[PDB]
TrEMBL record, chain B:
The lineage of its organism: Eukaryota, Metazoa, Chordata, Craniata, Vertebrata. Coiled coil: none annotated. This is Interferon regulatory factor 4. It comes from the Eukaryota. Residues 1-109 form the IRF tryptophan pentad repeat domain. Transcriptional activator. Binds to the interferon-stimulated response element (ISRE) of the MHC class I promoter. Binds the immunoglobulin lambda light chain enhancer, together with PU.1. Probably plays a role in ISRE-targeted signal transduction mechanisms specific to lymphoid cells. Involved in CD8(+) dendritic cell differentiation by forming a complex with the BATF-JUNB heterodimer in immune cells, leading to recognition of AICE sequence (5'-TGAnTCA/GAAA-3'), an immune-specific regulatory element, followed by cooperative binding of BATF and IRF4 and activation of genes. It is found in: Cytoplasm; Nucleus.
Length: 109, 109
DNA sequence: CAACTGAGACCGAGAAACC
DNA sequence: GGTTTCTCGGTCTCAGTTG
């Protein structure tokens, strides 16, 4: 669908703190991934990306759909793991840190 | 695909767990031993065999590789029992606060 | 100070809905 | 067919509470 182009556009936009690359080829990038109870959680800051994917696919209409960051992140994560265009480098992801992040590589084809 | 129901029924019909017995012939209500770990009368091996068996069934524990954790096993089994739609708790009949405390659970068709 | 608890959050793996 | 999403049956995390 649009996941590949949408995600690379969102990383290139820079409007999401933590959504950055790792090299110049832009084949490997980071993505913020916080739990919803770690205290340092800002609802409108960390869920923004997961909100955009709900707005881009019509899964969430402002004013006509009650907010739900859980299912937003659920949808985006399921589509990201099941996509054959992204491979999560499990060893390079950093989970037990301050403001965690996950490392992905886009496979070209 | 839900192994909790059949596994619990097998562990009850086997009878190798003292206290894990039925209370009726329809096999729809049963007793489960629920002792606190802080008590001196808490035998760490026998009073936690079922939670350890649940950890071993779902591959959560491997003897000789991981460190034993009876509290986490108890927490896991309790969360599975509360979240599952099959077993429901009869708190009014649980009859805790006896030398051999227990919980009474009911099976739902 | 461990052990325990419920409630909300999370997750991977089919089974669908969908382009 | 390829792609995103919905189900589902557990598990995880946290702020409390209890022994």
């Amino acid at each position: 669908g649009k996941l590949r182009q949408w995600l690379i556009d969102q990383i290139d936009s820079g409007k999401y703190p933590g959504l950055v690359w790792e090299n110049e080829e832009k084949s490997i990038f980071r993505i913020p991934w916080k739990h919803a109870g770690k205290q340092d959680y800002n609802r409108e800051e960390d869920a923004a990306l997961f909100k955009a994917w709900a707005l881009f696919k019509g899964k969430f209409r402002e004013g006509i759909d009650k907010p739900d960051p859980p299912t937003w992140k659920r949808r985006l994560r399921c589509a990201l793991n099941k996509s054959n265009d992204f491979e999560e480098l499990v060893e390079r992801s950093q989970l037990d840190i301050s403001d965690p992040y996950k490392v992905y590589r886009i496979v070209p084809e």
